[PDB]
Amino acid sequence: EHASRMSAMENSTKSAGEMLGKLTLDYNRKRQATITTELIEIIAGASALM
Amino acid sequence: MRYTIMVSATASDAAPLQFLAPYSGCAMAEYFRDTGKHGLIIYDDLSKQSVAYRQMSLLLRRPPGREAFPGDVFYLHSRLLERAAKLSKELGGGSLTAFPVIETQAGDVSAYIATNVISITDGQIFLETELFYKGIRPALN
Amino acid sequence: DLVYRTGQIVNVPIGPGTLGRVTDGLGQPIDGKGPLTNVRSSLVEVKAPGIIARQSVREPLFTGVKAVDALVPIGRGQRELIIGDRQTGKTAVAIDAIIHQKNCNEQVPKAQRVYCVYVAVGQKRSTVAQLVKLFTQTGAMRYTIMVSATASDAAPLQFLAPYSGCAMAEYFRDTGKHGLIIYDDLSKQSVAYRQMSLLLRRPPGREAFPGDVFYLHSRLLERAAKLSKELGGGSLTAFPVIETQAGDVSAYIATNVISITDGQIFLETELFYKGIRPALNVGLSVSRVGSAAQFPGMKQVAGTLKLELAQYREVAAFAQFGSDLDAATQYVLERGARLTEMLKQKQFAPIPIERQTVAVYAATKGFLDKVRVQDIVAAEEAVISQVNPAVFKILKANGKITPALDAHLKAELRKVKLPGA
Amino acid sequence: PAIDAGYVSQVIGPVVDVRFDGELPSILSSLEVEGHSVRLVLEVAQHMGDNTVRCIAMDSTDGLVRGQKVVDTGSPIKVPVGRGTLGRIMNVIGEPVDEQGPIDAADIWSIHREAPEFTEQSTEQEILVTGIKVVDLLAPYQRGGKIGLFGGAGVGKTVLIMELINNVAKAHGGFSVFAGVGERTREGNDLYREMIESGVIKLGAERGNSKCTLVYGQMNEPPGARARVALTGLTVAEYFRDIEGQDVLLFVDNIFRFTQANSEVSALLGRIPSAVGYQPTLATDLGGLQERITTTTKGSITSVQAVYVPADDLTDPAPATTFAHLDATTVLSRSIAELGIYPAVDPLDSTSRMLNPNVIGAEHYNVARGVQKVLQDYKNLQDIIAILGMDELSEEDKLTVARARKIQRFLSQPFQVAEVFTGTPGKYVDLADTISGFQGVLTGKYDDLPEMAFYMVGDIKEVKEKADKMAKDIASRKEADNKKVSEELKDIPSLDKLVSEIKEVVIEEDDGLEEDFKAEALSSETVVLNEEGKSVPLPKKN
Amino acid sequence: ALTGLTVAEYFRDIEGQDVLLFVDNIFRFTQANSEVSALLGRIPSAVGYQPTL
């Protein structure tokens, strides 16, 4: 039991590092898209006035 | 249909017709509220009336805001939904209850029009798409 | 300043005088070999040929890459996206295609030769110079034009260099010959066009790209076609290259060119650092137009190869890594490793297709299962060296492994000295 | 002569402004430019004031000068409509591009029609069986309804719409109208050759027996042509619906390209952009297009429209606006395709108005809702299975995961149009076979059979006939040792007699590309035009 | 909010009293100033509020 839990928790660290690595890239894409869309909104507001 | 009025500004109609159709339906429903009867008004797809208002104001060259909506898109739904009231006895005691509908995108409740109409209305009825596919119909969260 | 009009829509020199010449994005040569002599000017913005002007893709364009010509076969007139991260071997596949067109051009008649155009958009000038030295020292510059709008050039030149190279290749398409154009880093053309659009104060869309950034690549890639018999019968094959960030192929320009081209060559960044080169993502990369335009014999073995690599990815990286090992499906693991190491191939060495179908015949029929996985790359060259060269000529001329040929091939495949083991 | 003739004021890409000094054309009225290299048709979009209209060109504007005479046609874009358009390919402005002569027009209709009124709406929810398991089970298609195939560039909404053409349009009794909006020209040529070969398009004298009209505005065309070619397809379909009284099929590949072309021309019309970069008039343009496709009282149109999501974003405004126009969405997913499941239909994102127990019966409805419940319970467990494994699930949940992994292989199906690149023959599946199969997988009748026995099979019979072949084959590890001996002198010669009977081809050095070549003389100095128009070199001043 | 505040400021300064000022949703002050600021000729600030927030 102890030696199989030692391997199952290694598999869980591997899976929760893989999931975290994909979710970090997803967050970075969402962050980049967020600054881009907020900046495009500010430029579209300023180009209607200037 | 004996008790129902239907105000229908469809997708083929102009943007001011879809912008003005909740106000037309509220004015038709305020007759029962002001003459002592009790009214029920459903603004189905209020998030499409906001989109029609966005188009109508962007083509008037007014400056855009959050998701290119007008700045006064809160006032658009607040001055519409505040007309749903329960009057006093000296005004007849008539009532009008509103059921506005907002469509969200992928369950994002933090959208602009969604948060505005949540801050305007009294209650909320949330319908999740994961409760819908688990057999729970209506999918009340 | 005085601005004079020339009287002509934006044109580049097209013709047989462009072969061997390095060019900028406007038509004037930069290799220092004087002006273009045997040439004439045509427009860079040509409407693509219509529906009647095309015919179905029948003939195969051999890349010379084993992983490409077996699993994602590419016909003449196709558009095949080469997509992947930075330093995953996209340019290597493209220049293996150009070198292999040089190698096959000396063995076919002149009506079946392929004249290549390499458009380098946004690259370093040093890598373009090294690539010109490569195409000169491999003899491939005789059939190759190189258009070069480097990173120092103006962004209108990087925007226009794919259209310039496409007109230079549309000469070969329209005159009944066969062309092969490679838009290397077509993402950099969209970056240059985004620069031109934002400096023109046009309202930006997704990822600050203009609204007509799909039209920018569809104009370019619809000109790669296979013309009908009443238009000369010529063809133009496009190899657009799109670079992805962290393997995100759901990006804007990536999904634009995926929804334009016929197939894809997904080059995974994980297999490129595990030594598997070319790092072809076999699960994602398709080619559904040159699937009918495949060399038969390679179509006889490569379907079984792709099926066995499909059922190899049912135990992919959980052989005993996750919970357990079966030891009845040890065979699919120790055979998919052989089929993986069979498809690895070093750079600047493209293989004729008759020497690829024999290698995948030896890898698939079971002539290499007792070879250790560390020496299958030596076993392949030992098979190609030790089997007599008559079977290569018979398979190249007949165009299929005949029932008269597979017996002699299994005869010549059981008397090879596979090293080690 | 000077009346009804304006001149080009300014050329901004596909947007041309024309100044009419005498009298201005109406909005949507078509104009024609005199002296162009092609027939350049402009369509008036705005009146800008100062006697100037603002137009949208149906072809390219390269070569336009700002003095060119522009003739008002006095009408919108009129295309030939009728039974004489059957078997013909036509572009956005009705010109025959199939090189079969002029189109024998029964009439010429304006491509801008008002949508049919509220009194001319037909509310008849009748099912249309397609032979696709996931489509017939989880989101069935209405017989006279609008159908969307939402997809993300490579997930298979062209293979799905080709299979719907293969399955539905052959069993149909009316006319089909394929509108190609912004798709590949190779795909239009492939569909033309397949429809000529299969006999639904006939050439020459038997052209009247052809049952399909192709209207092609593909992605090589400028954004003015891709913005109005859906209207040409609608006009050809609306003539069959309204005047002919027929039941029409209308397949529109990539209705997104209409929206994208309007957003491309909208930046040069001088508008403030809406959300993520589209035009402010997205919803009203899409509504004015999609409300013309209606089963009326005098005819029905079964519309199947492929919709493209731009970066696998369903929250993008152009598919999110399209979602409210359709009776049955079939959302194809990238992840389902990456699992190898084809058609890659998301079962928990595709919906239909026909999935109602009072219209398709309670048995079919209960089966579809049970399959969706099992798939939703598996999607709820997708994170525990990933980060912990299946060994930590409950015994009731491992059964849920097993039945869900069976039903999500069983939703996949081979296609008759995908058999050319997959090798497996296609499967048409009847509706009762789908309900009878998914009843058996829901109740637990097939917990014996493995998960891959359900993958890419037709019906529930073929699951059992594949689990037989999967267990004959593991017993076929020890069947025989195959050897063919004493064979070399039966019919096969040798190695060297074969190289003597091949026909080696002749090769030629110095390829000779100077045959039929013009070879104009490009001099060193760049040639410009002086003020009298002569081709002179540059002056020596900078 | 300025009207309720000047009633409380009269009750604080002149009457000298200790005042309670309950303001329900002071967010709507900034929201109401945001709805007019594009029409006052001000280019927008961060997420969609006025530059003078």
Ligand SMILES: Nc1ncnc2c1ncn2[C@@H]1O[C@H](COP(=O)(O)OP(=O)(O)OP(=O)(O)O)[C@@H](O)[C@H]1O
């Ligand atoms: N099949 C191969 N075998 C061995 N090495 C290879 C192979 N293909 C490429 N390489 C090496 O790996 C590197 C990949 O460079 P390459 O230009 O092919 O990638 P790329 O995707 O074009 O990168 P970038 O876009 O950044 O130029 C090169 O240095 C090359 O020498």
Ligand SMILES: Nc1ncnc2c1ncn2[C@@H]1O[C@H](COP(=O)(O)OP(=O)(O)O)[C@@H](O)[C@H]1O
């Ligand atoms: N039913 C199917 N069977 C097998 N392969 C499919 C199927 N549907 C799609 N594919 C694969 O996915 C790709 C989808 O291409 P396409 O049909 O053009 O979709 P899209 O128009 O969305 O790009 C094809 O290259 C094909 O290989």
Ligand SMILES: [Mg+2]
């Ligand atoms: Mg490169």
Ligand SMILES: [Mg+2]
């Ligand atoms: Mg497509």
